[PDB]
């Protein structure tokens, strides 16, 4: 289903995937998505969160995201599990 | 109804209530209630929170409260808009 979200959820959320530490910094209805490699290095991709429809575009790949509070639960389309992030302040 | 709150809602929240400035903390599943009277006078309650149930207690009054992002909306049991408070941080 589509569920809309809380329009207002700036922060910094922080989390793991796939061994790389995420950092999600959300302002307004934009937003960055920074992931910390194990060399050190980072990947930053821009981030844009449509509330009403529940969608969280990352670079050019569309997401589900879903608001409890402190924490945003970051799902692929297909709801995939083994795919789902989950991201806290 | 109902609906069961996120449990992780750490924070600040201020609003405006009757003239007076609120100020929830919230730590964990309890937290502080401050007023601030127009006289610069403060009265300070403490709060429960209740997640599943959906139930703050706030010094011995009983409220619901709806979690939203940053925003927290405190409600008479009733849910008398003339008495919803809103709360963000
Ligand atoms: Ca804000
Ligand atoms: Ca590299
Ligand atoms: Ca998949
Ligand atoms: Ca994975
Ligand atoms: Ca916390
Ligand atoms: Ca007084
Ligand atoms: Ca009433
Ligand atoms: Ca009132």
Same mark, same amino acid.
């Given at each position: =289903?589509?569920?809309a979200q809380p329009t207002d959820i700036d922060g910094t959320? #922080? /989390? =793991? @995937? @796939?061994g790389d530490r995420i950092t999600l910094v959300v302002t307004? #209805? #934009?937003?960055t998505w920074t992931e910390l490699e194990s060399? /050190? @290095?980072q990947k930053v991709k821009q981030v844009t969160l449509d509330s009403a429809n529940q969608r969280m575009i990352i670079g050019d790949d569309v997401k589900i995201y879903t608001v409890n509070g402190n924490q945003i639960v970051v799902d692929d389309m297909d709801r995939d599990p083994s795919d789902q992030i989950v991201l806290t302040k």
């Amino acid at each position: =289903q589509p569920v809309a979200q809380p329009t207002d959820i700036d922060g910094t959320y #922080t /989390g =793991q @995937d @796939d061994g790389d530490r995420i950092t999600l910094v959300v302002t307004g #209805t #934009t937003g960055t998505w920074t992931e910390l490699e194990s060399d /050190g @290095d980072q990947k930053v991709k821009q981030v844009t969160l449509d509330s009403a429809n529940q969608r969280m575009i990352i670079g050019d790949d569309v997401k589900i995201y879903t608001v409890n509070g402190n924490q945003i639960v970051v799902d692929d389309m297909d709801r995939d599990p083994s795919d789902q992030i989950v991201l806290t302040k």
